[PDB]
Amino acid sequence: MKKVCFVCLGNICRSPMAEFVMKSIVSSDVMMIESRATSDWEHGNPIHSGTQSILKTYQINYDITKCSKQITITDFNTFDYIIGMDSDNVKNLKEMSQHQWDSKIYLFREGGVPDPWYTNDFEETYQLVRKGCQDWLSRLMSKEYLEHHH
Ligand SMILES: [Cl-]
Ligand SMILES: [Cl-]
Ligand SMILES: [Cl-]
Description:
By secondary structure, this protein is an alpha/beta fold. The protein has one domain: 3-Layer(aba) Sandwich (Rossmann fold). The chain has seven helices and four strands. It has helices spanning 14-23, 49-57, 73-78, 87-96, 116-119, 122-140, 143-148; strands at 2-8, 31-37, 81-84, 105-107. The protein has a four-stranded parallel beta sheet. The structure holds chloride ion (CL) (3 copies). It is classed as hydrolase. Keywords: SP-PTP, Streptococcus pyogenes.
């Protein structure tokens, strides 16, 4: 079971969106998927309204109990892939872990995902997260898995 963690600054906008979009395209039995924040700055707060609204609009199930959670030393050891939503998340992930795990740290998509904390365009965010989740699936799953879904 591959263990994937999407990461952004506050874990209320982009990275939770990736968690639940990814969870909608691959089974809990073959991939374990969570999300985290690099910072403290939103800890305990629920998914941002813009991500919640997007997920409801596209009928993507999510855990209403989900709250912003900062990534921990345990997480860096446990997760196989720690995927930052933009290059700032990637850099901060590497420094806060003193570069001990750089080979598990990835950028979600080349060029990045625009930050809807600034653009407020959660539709653009959804479309890019949805496509990037598809790419991660083709990257992380075996060819045999790909050929039988769907
Ligand atoms: Cl944020
Ligand atoms: Cl990067
Ligand atoms: Cl790979």
